[PDB]
Amino acid sequence: GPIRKVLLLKEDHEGLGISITGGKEHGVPILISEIHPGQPADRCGGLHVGDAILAVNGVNLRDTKHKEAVTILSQQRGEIEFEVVYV
Amino acid sequence: SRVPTSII
Structure with missing residues (x-):
């Protein structure tokens, strides 16, 4: 998409x-495999199970290893911008 | 199973 x-x-x-x-x-x-009810991703409205996360706050995640992506994603605070695509 | 999942 x-x-x-x-x-x-x-x-x-x-x-x-x-x-x-x-x-x-x-x-x-990096794929979203679950969205927890009531937590921030659910509340934001725009993320879906099956979405690939291409970037977060301008940081490219297309070529990142699993644990690299965990560290980068968990570091983000507050108002967080995602670039995503559902295939 | 080969591919890991993390809760974040």
Whole structure:
């Protein structure tokens, strides 16, 4: 589908509210495999299970290994911009 | 199963 930009608002006591799979070392993108009900990704409205995360806050995740993506994603705070695509 | 999942 089309590449989309999505805004998520996270408070500091919360995580993003997603599970991710994949990573460059596995030859698969960083994919959203779960969205937790009531947590920030669900509340933002614009993210879906099956979305590939292409970037977050301008940081490219297309070529990142699984744990690299975990570190980068967990570091983001507050108003967080995602670039995503559903294939 | 080959591919890991992390809750974040």
